[PDB]
């Protein structure tokens, strides 16, 4: 295939994981 | 290409005690010679390598002089 | 002291060359280094520096009264042959040359490769 597709997917996943890390304590507070 | 001297009828058995037959197959540094050089089959080459390692572990051949 | 027959150790790496003359029992009687002869930095990795270091160490060994020397060499050579010839040209007689380089049997971990 072409690596542009994997590149788009990796960037989206990277941004989501960064967001998850940024809001860990808040999410634990709300979910509990 | 040569032949496996052990696949012949008169091929002697491989023993880890037999220093001369094992030393036939070790180089001047003590390392074991490759299968292409010696010309023996896979099975007998494995037997030779294991016998040489056994002899090394009991101080009959040097650990790579 | 009077030792008429000693041994020579040449360590030749990619950054320096060290020459040591020892007794047959290993006691060091003279040594010279590639940076001991006025070379600093990368300049001390060249064959010329190895030649000068070998000459200097051979001189120092000669004032202690050594005639014949055996050679054990070690490391990734850049100034091996140069050091051998410099030892020969200083009046010492090179008896035997043997390469003793430590070669592991796959233990320990090499440092990560450069890029």
């Amino acid at each position: 295939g072409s690596v542009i597709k994997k590149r788009r997917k990796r960037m989206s996943k990277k941004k989501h994981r960064k967001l998850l890390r940024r809001t860990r304590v808040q999410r634990r507070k709300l979910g509990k | 290409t040569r032949k496996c001297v052990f696949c012949s009828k008169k091929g002697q058995t491989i023993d880890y005690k037999d220093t001369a037959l094992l030393r036939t197959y070790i180089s001047e540094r003590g390392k074991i010679r490759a299968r292409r050089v010696t010309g023996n089959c896979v099975q007998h080459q494995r037997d030779i390598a294991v016998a040489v390692k056994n002899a090394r572990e009991v101080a009959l051949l040097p650990f790579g002089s | 002291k009077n030792v008429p027959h000693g041994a020579a150790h040449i360590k030749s790496t990619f950054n320096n060359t060290i020459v040591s003359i020892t007794d047959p029992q290993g006691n060091v009687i003279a040594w010279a280094s590639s940076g001991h002869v006025g070379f600093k930095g990368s300049r001390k990795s060249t064959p010329f520096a190895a030649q000068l270091a070998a000459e200097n160490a051979a001189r120092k060994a000669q004032e202690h009264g050594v005639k014949k020397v055996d050679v054990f060499v070690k490391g990734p050579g850049s100034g091996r042959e140069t050091a051998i010839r410099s030892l020969q040209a200083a009046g010492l007689e090179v008896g035997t040359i043997s390469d003793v380089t430590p070669q592991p049997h796959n233990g320990c971990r090499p440092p990560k490769r450069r890029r």
């Binding site: - | - | 042959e81 140069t82 010839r85």
Partner: protein
Amino acid sequence: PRKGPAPKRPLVNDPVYGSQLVTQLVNKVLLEGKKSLAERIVYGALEQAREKTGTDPVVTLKRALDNVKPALEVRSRRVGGATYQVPVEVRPDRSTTLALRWLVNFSRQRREKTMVERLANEILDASNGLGASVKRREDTHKMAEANRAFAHYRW
């Protein structure tokens, strides 16, 4: 000279002596483009040698150049930005060429303030072996023999 060696130039036979060494020397000492003056300079030097040694010029110049003819040379070969000095033997032609070039080039340094006696004196000194050309020859052989180690490139 990239494809192959150019054909060698012919040498015109010397009319007065019959050997081309003298005409080679006068061609080399020639400068500014004048054959007559250089010819007279070399001939004056040769005749001073005649009157000072009492022997035949051809043979004395022959063994003088033979005694100052180099045998080996040192050549540079560069790898990785660092140079190496390799010894290569020399064909006799370039050996004589270099010897005569040394003679002519250094014949402008004798302090007797005239070129013709300069040539006569240096020719006689090289005939006696005390000339500076002998010194350069010995230096070249010292360089060749001392650095005989670095020749594994085989050139």
